[PDB]
mmCIF file of C-alpha atoms (C1' of nucleotides) and ligand atoms in Angstrom:
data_model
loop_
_atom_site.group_PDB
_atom_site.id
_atom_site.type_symbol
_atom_site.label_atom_id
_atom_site.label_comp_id
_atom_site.label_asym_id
_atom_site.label_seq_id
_atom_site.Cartn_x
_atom_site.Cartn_y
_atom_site.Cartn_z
ATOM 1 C CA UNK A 1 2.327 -3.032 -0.826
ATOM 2 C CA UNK A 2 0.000 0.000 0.000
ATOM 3 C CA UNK A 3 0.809 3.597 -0.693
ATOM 4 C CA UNK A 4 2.449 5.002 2.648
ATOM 5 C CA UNK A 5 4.611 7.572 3.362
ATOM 6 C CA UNK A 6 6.876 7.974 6.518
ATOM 7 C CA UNK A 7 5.373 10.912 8.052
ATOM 8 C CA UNK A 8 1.719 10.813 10.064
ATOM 9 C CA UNK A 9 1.039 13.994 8.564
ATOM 10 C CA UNK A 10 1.612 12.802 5.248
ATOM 11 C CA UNK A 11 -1.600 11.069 5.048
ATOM 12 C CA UNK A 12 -5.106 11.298 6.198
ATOM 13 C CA UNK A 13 -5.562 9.205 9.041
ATOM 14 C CA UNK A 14 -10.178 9.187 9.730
ATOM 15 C CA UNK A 15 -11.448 8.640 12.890
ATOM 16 C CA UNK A 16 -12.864 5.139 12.044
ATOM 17 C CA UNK A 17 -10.501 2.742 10.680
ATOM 18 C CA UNK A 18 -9.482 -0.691 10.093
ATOM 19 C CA UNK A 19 -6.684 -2.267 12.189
ATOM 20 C CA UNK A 20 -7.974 -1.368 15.088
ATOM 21 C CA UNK A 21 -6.779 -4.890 17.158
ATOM 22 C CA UNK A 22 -3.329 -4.803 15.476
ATOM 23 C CA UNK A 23 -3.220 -1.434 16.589
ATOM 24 C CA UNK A 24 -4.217 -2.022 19.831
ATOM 25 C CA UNK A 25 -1.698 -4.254 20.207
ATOM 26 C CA UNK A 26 0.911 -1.972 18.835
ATOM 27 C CA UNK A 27 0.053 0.471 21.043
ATOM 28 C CA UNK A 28 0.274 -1.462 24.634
ATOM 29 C CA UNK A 29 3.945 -2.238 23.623
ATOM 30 C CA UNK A 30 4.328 1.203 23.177
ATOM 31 C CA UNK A 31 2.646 2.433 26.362
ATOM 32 C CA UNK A 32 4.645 -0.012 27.864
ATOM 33 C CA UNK A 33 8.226 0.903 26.249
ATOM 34 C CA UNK A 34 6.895 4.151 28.061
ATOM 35 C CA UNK A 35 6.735 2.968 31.492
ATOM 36 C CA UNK A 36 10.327 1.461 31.040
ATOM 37 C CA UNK A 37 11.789 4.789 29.681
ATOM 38 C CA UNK A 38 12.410 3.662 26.133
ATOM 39 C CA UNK A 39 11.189 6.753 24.509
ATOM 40 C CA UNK A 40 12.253 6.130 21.436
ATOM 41 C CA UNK A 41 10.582 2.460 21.215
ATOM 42 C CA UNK A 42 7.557 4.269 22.421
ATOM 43 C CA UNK A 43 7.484 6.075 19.377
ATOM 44 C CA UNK A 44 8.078 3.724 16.520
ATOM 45 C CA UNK A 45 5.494 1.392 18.521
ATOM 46 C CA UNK A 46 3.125 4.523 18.027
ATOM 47 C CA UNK A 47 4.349 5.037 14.932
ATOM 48 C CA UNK A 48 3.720 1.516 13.156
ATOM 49 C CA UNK A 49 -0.121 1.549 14.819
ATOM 50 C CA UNK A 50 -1.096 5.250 13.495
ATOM 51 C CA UNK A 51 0.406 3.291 10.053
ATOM 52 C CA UNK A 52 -1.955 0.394 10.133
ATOM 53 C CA UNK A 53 -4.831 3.284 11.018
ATOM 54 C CA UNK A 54 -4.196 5.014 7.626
ATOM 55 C CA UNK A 55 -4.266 2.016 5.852
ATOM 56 C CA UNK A 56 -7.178 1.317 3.232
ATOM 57 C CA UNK A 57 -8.153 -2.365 4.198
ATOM 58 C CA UNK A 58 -7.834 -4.727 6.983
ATOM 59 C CA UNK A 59 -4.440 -6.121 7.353
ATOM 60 C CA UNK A 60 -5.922 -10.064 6.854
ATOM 61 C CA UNK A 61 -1.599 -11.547 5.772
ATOM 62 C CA UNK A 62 1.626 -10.652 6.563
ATOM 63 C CA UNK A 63 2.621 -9.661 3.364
ATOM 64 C CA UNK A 64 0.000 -6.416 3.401
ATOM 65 C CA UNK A 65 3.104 -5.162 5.915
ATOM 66 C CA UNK A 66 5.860 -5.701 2.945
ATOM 67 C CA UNK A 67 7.546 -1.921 2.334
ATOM 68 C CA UNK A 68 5.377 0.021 5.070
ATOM 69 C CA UNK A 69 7.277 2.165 7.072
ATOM 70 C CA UNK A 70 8.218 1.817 10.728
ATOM 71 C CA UNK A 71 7.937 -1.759 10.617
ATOM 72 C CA UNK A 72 10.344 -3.821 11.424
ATOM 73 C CA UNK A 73 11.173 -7.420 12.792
ATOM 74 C CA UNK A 74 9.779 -6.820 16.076
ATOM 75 C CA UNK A 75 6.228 -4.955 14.785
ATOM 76 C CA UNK A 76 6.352 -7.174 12.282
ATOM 77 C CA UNK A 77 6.010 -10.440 14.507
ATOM 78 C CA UNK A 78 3.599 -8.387 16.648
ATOM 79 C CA UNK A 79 1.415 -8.527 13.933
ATOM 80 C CA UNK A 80 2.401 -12.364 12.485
ATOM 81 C CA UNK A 81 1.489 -13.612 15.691
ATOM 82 C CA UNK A 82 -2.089 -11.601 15.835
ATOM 83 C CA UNK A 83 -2.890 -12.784 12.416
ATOM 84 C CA UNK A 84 -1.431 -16.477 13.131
ATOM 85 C CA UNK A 85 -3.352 -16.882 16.552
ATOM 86 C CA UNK A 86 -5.498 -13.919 17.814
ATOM 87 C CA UNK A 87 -3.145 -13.030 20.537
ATOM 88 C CA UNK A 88 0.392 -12.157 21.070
ATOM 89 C CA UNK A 89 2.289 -13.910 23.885
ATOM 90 C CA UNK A 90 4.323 -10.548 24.658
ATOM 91 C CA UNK A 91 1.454 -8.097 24.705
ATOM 92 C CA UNK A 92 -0.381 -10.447 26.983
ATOM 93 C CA UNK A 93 2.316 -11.193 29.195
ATOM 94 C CA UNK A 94 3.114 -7.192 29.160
ATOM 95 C CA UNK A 95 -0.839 -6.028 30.016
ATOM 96 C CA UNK A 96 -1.420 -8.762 32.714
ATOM 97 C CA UNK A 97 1.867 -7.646 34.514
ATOM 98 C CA UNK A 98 1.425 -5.915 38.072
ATOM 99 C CA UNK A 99 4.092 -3.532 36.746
ATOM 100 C CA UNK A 100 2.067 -2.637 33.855
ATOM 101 C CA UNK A 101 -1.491 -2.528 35.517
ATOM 102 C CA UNK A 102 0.111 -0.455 38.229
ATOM 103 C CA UNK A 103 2.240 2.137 35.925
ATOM 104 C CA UNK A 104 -1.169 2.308 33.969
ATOM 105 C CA UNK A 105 -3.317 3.039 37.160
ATOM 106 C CA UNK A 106 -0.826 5.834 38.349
ATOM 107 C CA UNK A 107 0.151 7.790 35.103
ATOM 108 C CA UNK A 108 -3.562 7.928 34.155
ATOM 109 C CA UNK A 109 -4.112 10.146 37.521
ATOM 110 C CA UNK A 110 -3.729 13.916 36.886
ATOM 111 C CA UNK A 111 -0.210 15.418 38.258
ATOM 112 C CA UNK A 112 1.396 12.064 38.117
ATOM 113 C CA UNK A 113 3.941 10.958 35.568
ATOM 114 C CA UNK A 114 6.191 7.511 34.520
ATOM 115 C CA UNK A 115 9.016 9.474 36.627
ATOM 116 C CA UNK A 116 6.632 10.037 39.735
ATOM 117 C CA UNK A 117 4.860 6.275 39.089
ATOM 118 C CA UNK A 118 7.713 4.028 38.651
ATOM 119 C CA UNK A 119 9.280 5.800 42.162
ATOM 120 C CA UNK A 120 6.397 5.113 43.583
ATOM 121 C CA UNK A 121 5.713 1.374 42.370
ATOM 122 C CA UNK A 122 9.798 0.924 43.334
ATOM 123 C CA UNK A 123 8.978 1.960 46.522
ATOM 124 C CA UNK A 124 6.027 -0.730 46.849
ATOM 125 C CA UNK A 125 2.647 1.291 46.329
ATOM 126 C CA UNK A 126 0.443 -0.176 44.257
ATOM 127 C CA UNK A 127 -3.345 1.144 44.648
ATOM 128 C CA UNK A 128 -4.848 4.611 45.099
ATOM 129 C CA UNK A 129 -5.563 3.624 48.624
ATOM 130 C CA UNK A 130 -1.653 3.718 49.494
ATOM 131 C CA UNK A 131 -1.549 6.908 47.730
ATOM 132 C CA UNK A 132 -3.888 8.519 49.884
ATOM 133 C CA UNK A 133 -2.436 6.958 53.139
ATOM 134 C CA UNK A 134 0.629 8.535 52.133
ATOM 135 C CA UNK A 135 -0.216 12.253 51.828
ATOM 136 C CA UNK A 136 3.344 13.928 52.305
ATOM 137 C CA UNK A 137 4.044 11.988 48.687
ATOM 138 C CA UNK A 138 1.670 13.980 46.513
ATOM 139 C CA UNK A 139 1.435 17.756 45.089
ATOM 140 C CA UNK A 140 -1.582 19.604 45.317
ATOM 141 C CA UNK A 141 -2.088 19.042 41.417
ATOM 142 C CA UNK A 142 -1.817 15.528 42.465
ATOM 143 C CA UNK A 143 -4.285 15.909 45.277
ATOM 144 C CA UNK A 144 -6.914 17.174 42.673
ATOM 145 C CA UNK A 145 -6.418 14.048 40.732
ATOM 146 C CA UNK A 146 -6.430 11.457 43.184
ATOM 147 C CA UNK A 147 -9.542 13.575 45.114
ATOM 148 C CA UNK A 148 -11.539 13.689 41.176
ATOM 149 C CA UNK A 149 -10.214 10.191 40.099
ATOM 150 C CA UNK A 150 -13.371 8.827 39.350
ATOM 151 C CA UNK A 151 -15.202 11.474 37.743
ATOM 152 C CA UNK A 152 -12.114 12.403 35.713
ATOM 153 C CA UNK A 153 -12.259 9.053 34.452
ATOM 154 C CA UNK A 154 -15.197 9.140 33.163
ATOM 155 C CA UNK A 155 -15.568 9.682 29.163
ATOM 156 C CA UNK A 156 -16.186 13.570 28.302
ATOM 157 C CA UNK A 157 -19.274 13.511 25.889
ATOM 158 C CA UNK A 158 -20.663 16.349 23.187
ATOM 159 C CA UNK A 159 -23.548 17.356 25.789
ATOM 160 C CA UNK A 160 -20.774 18.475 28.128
ATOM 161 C CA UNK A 161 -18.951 19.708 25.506
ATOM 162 C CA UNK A 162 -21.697 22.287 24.780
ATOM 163 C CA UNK A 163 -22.546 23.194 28.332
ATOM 164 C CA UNK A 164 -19.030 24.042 29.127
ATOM 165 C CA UNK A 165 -18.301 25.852 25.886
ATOM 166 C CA UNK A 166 -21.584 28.274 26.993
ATOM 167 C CA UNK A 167 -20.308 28.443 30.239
ATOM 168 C CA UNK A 168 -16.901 29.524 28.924
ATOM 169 C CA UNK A 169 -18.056 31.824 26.519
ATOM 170 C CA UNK A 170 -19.902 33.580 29.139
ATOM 171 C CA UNK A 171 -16.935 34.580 31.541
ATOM 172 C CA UNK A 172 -14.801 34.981 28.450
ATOM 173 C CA UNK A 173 -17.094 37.625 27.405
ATOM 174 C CA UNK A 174 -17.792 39.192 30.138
ATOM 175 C CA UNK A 175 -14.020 39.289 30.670
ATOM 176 C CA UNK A 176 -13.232 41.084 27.487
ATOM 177 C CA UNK A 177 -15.797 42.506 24.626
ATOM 178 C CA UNK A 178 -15.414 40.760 21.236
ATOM 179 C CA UNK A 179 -13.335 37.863 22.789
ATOM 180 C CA UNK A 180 -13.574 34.206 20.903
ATOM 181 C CA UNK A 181 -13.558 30.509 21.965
ATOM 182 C CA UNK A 182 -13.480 27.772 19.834
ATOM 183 C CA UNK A 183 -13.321 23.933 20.646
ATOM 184 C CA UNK A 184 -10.166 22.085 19.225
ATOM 185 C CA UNK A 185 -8.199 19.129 20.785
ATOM 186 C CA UNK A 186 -10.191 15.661 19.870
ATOM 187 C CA UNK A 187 -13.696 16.927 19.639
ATOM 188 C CA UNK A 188 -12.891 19.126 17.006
ATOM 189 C CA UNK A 189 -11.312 16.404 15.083
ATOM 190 C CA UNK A 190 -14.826 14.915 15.589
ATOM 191 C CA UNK A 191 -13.707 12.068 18.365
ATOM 192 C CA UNK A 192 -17.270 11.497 20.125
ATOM 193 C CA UNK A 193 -15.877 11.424 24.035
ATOM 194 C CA UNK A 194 -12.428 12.653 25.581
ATOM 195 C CA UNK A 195 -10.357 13.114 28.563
ATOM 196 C CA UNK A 196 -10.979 16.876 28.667
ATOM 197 C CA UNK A 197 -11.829 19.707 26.988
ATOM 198 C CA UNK A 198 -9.914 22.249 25.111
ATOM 199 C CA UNK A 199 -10.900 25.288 23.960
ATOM 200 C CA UNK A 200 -8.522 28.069 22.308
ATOM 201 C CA UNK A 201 -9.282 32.012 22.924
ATOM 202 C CA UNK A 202 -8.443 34.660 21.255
ATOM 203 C CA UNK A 203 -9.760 38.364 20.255
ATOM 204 C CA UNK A 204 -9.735 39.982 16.697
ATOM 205 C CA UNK A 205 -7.585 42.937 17.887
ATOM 206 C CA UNK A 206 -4.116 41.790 18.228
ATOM 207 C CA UNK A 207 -2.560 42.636 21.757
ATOM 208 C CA UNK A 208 -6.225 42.842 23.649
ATOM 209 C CA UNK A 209 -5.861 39.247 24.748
ATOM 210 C CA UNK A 210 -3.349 40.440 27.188
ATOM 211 C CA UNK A 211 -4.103 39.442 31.110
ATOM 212 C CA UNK A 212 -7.300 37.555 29.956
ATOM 213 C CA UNK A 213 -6.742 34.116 31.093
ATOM 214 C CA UNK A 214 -6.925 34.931 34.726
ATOM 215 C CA UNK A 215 -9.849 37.606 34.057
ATOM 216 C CA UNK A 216 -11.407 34.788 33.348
ATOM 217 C CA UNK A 217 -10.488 31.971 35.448
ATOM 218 C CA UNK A 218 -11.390 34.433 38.670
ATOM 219 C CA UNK A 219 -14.817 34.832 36.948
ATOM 220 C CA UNK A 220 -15.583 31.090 36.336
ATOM 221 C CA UNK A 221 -14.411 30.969 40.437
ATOM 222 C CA UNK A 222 -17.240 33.100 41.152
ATOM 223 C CA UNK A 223 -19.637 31.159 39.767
ATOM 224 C CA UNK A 224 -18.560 28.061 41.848
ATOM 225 C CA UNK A 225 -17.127 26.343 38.398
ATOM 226 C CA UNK A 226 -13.647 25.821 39.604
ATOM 227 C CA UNK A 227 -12.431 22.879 42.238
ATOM 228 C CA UNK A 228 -9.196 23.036 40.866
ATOM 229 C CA UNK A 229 -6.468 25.726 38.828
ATOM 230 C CA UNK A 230 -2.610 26.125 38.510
ATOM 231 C CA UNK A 231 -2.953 28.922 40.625
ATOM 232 C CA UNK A 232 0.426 35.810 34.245
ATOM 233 C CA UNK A 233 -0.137 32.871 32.468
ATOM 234 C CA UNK A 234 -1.376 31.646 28.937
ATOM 235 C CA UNK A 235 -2.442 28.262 29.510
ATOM 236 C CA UNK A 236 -5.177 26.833 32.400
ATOM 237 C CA UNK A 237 -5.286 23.036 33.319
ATOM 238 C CA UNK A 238 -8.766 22.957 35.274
ATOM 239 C CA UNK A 239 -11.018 21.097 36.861
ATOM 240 C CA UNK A 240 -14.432 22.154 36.702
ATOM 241 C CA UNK A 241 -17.248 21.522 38.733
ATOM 242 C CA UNK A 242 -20.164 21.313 36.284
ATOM 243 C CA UNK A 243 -23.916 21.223 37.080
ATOM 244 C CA UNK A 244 -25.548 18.028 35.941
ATOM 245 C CA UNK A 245 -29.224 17.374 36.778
ATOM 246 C CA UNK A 246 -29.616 17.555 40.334
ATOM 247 C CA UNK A 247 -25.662 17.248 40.528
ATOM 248 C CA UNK A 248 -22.248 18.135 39.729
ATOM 249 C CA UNK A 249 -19.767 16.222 38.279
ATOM 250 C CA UNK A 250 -15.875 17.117 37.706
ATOM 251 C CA UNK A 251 -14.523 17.671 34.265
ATOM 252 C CA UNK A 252 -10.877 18.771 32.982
ATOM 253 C CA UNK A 253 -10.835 21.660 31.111
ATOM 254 C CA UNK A 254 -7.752 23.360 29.358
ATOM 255 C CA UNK A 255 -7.955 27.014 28.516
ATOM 256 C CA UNK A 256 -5.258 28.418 26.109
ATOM 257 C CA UNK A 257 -5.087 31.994 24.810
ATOM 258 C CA UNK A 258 -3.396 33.218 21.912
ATOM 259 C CA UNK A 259 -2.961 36.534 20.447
ATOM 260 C CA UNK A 260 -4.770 36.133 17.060
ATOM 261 C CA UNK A 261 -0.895 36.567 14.630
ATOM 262 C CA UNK A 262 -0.330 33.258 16.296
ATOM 263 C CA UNK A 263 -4.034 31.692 16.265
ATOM 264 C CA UNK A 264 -3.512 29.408 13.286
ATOM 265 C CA UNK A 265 -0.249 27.896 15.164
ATOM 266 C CA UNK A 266 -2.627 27.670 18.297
ATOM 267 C CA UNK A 267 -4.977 25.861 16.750
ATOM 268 C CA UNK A 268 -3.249 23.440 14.404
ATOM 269 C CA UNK A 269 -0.984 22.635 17.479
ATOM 270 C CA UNK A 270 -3.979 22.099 20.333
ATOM 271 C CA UNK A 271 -5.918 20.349 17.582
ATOM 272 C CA UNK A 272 -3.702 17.605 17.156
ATOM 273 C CA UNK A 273 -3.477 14.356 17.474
ATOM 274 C CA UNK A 274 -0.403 14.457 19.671
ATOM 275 C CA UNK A 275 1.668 11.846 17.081
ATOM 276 C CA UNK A 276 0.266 14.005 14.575
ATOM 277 C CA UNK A 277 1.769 17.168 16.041
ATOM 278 C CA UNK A 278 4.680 15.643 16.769
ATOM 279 C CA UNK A 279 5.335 14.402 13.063
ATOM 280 C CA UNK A 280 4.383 17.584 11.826
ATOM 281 C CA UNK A 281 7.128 19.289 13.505
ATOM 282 C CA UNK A 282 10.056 16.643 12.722
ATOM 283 C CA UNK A 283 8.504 17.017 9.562
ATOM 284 C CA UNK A 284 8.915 20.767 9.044
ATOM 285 C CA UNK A 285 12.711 20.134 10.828
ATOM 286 C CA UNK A 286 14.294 18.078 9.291
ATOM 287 C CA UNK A 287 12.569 18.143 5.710
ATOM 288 C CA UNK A 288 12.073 21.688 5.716
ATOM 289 C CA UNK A 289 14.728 23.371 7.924
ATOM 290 C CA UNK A 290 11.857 25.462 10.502
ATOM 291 C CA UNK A 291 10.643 25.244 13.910
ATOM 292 C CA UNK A 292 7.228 24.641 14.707
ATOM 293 C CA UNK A 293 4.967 25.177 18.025
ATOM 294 C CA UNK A 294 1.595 26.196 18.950
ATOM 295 C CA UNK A 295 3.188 30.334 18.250
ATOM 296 C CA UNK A 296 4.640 30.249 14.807
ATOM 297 C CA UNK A 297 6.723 28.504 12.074
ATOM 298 C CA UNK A 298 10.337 29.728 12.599
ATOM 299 C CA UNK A 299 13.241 30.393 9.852
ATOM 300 C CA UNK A 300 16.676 30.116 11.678
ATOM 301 C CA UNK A 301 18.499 30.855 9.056
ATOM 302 C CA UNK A 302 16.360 34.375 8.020
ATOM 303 C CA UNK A 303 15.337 35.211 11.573
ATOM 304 C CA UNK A 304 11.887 35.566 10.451
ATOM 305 C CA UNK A 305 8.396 34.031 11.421
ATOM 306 C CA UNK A 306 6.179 33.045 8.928
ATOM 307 C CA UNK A 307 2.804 34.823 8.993
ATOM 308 C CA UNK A 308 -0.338 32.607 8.559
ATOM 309 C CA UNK A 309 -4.095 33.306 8.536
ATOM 310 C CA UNK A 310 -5.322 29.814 8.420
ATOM 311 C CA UNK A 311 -4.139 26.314 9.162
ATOM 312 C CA UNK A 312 -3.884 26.237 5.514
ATOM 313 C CA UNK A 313 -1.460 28.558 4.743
ATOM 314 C CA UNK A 314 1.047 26.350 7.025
ATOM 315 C CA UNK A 315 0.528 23.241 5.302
ATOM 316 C CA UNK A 316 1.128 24.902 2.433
ATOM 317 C CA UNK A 317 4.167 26.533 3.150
ATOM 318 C CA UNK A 318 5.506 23.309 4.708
ATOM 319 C CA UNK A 319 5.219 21.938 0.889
ATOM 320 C CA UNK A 320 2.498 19.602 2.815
ATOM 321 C CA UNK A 321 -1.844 18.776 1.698
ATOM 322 C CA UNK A 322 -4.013 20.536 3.783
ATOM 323 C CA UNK A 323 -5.772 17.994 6.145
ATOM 324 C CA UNK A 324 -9.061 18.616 7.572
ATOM 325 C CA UNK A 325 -8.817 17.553 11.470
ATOM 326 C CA UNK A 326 -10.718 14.990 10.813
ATOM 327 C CA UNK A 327 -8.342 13.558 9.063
ATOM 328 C CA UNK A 328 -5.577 14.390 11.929
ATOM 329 C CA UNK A 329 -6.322 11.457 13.886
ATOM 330 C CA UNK A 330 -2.744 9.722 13.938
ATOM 331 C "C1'" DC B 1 25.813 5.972 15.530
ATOM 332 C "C1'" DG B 2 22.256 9.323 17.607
ATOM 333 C "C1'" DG B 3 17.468 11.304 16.971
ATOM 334 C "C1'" DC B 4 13.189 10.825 18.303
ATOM 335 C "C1'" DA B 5 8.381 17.934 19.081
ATOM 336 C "C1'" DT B 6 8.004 21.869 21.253
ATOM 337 C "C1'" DC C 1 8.951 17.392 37.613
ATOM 338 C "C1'" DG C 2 4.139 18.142 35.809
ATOM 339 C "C1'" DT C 3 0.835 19.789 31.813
ATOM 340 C "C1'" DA C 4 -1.027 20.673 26.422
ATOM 341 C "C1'" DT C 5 -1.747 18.592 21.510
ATOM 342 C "C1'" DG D 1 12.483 0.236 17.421
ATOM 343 C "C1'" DC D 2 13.255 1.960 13.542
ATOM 344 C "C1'" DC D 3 15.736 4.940 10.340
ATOM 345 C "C1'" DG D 4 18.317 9.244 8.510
HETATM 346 CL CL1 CL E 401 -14.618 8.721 19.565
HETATM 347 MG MG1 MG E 402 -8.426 16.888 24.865
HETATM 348 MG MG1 MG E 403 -6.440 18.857 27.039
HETATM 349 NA NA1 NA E 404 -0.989 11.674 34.426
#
DNA sequence: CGGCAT
DNA sequence: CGTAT
DNA sequence: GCCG
């Protein structure tokens, strides 16, 4: 074989594809490569799943791998052993390990990393219970996670979605006139439930956007909205509290401002995927020779920033098809 | 051999 | 260290 | 783990 080029953001990758076990698969080893600090293995593991996402058929034979990139002998066999028995004797032994089920259990709390985990599994805990015993251990960041575990495990849906966007809108308007918010990360690149939400602001008159974010973080406080914030600053990892019927339940929320010369960076970056994002940016690096982030498209060589209106115009100038986000989904 | 996003 | 995609 |  299939047409495939090296790069994630090289090709459309949909929200529904085929693959999905193999990549499943692919993707434990590379959660687990993770845990062990194996960066690098944790990103061609990624790498070979978003590759069997963007593919246009099931994978049914081994040969359907021949010439694809990022796979190798040990994705490869992954994937032989799948096709040749329904399971894989290293991804089973890997998700049915204590070390795994624990590192799994600990990274997915918010404020806690493989770093923080794996000290924490060396030094014997193994349930959220012994975190809690152990209070001295933990940040406050950490405290809001382990206090909102099991709402913040919960799947985001679109209903919440559009409650929290209204609510947003409100403080951010009422915190400056003529102020925008608009939805990106996963639900923008039409994913039906998430982790969070994230929503990008901005305001049409560049340099206005100055001091918002805590204008409006004190203003969703006053309402009661807030059980948890960070706290000049430009990004907000929250937790809100938001009404349900008869109830409340706790949601992350990131707010991210951007002064609207760097929107388009903003919102290409916080729209992701994250393995798209990161491919895009090796991709403008090393093929192109500039720097990409979520506040421009850097020449190092010229000094200069490339000024964009749309998420268009930097696909373009990376030599790169536009991608709708739907299509972002790495 | 070292990079692997910023 | 943690967080955002 | 794969590749520039
Ligand atoms: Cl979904
Ligand atoms: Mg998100
Ligand atoms: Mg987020
Ligand atoms: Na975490």
């Amino acid at each position: 074989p299939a047409w495939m080029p090296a790069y994630a953001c090289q090709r459309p990758t949909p929200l529904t594809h085929h693959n999905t076990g193999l990549s499943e698969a692919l993707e434990i080893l590379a959660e687990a490569a993770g845990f062990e600090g194996s960066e690098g293995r944790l990103l061609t593991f990624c790498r070979a799943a978003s590759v069997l996402k963007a593919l246009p058929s099931p994978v049914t034979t081994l040969s359907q791998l021949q010439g694809l990139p990022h796979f190798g002998e040990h994705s490869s066999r992954v994937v032989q052993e799948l096709l040749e028995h329904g399971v894989c004797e290293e991804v089973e032994r890997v998700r049915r390990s204590e070390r795994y089920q624990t590192m799994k259990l600990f990274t997915q709390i918010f404020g806690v990393g493989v770093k923080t985990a794996d000290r924490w599994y060396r030094e014997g805990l193994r349930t959220l219970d012994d975190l809690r015993e152990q209070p001295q251990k933990l940040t406050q960041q950490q405290k809001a996670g382990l206090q909102h575990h099991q709402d913040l495990s919960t799947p985001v849906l679109r209903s919440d979605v559009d409650a929290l966007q209204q609510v947003v809108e409100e403080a951010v308007g009422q915190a400056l006139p003529g102020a925008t918010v608009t939805l990106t990360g996963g639900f923008r690149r039409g994913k039906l439930q998430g982790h969070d939400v994230d929503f990008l602001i901005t305001h049409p008159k560049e340099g206005q956007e100055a001091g918002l974010l805590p204008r409006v973080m004190c203003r969703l406080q006053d309402q009661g909205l807030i059980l948890y914030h960070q706290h000049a600053f430009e990004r907000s990892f929250c937790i809100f509290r938001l009404p349900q019927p008869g109830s409340w339940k706790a949601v992350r929320v990131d707010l991210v401002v951007a002064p609207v010369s760097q929107f388009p960076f903003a919102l290409l970056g916080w729209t992701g995927s994250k393995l798209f994002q990161r491919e895009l940016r090796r991709f403008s690096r090393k093929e192109k020779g500039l720097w990409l982030n979520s506040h421009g498209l850097f020449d190092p060589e010229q000094k200069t920033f490339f000024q964009a209106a749309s998420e268009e115009d930097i696909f373009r100038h990376l030599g790169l098809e536009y991608l709708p986000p739907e299509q972002r989904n790495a």
